[PDB]
Design a protein around this nucleic acid. Structure first.
Length: 49
DNA sequence: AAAAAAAAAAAAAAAAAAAAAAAAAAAAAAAAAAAAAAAAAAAAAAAAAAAAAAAAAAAAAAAAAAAAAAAAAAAAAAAAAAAAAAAAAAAAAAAAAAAAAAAAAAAAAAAAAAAAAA
């Protein structure tokens, strides 16, 4: 649900691309901190296969 | 009383900055090992000193590698043009001590007010 409750948002996208390994990520939480480098799409798909 | 400049209304153009949260790097300032350097002790190889000696400069003189002369030929270096690197000369500057103008505390004394006595 939305913050107002008037609409709805997806909880997670039904992806076909491994977006986390491919595009990477970077963020600063309060206790944690993520830093994932990007990867090549063909190699990651080969690993998935 | 004339001139000039600020400011404010509302639709337009275009910008700038402070913090949180984790993880890694980069400056920049300290204790603290670690070795030069220096003062002040005892200690010990070198100059002195002397007598005694024999190894290499003189001297004779031949001769054999030599330095000047002659020639031919190759082409390194010097001076004149330009084009870059790198350092004193001179002038400028931002904090920084000096001076001057405005805010807060001070009481002396009185106007107005509030309150109560007989």
């Amino acid at each position: 649900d939305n913050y107002d409750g008037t609409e709805k948002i997806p909880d997670v996208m039904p992806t076909k691309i491994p977006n986390l390994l491919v595009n990477g990520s970077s963020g600063i939480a309060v206790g944690m901190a993520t830093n994932i480098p990007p990867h090549n799409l063909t190699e990651v798909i080969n690993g998935c296969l």
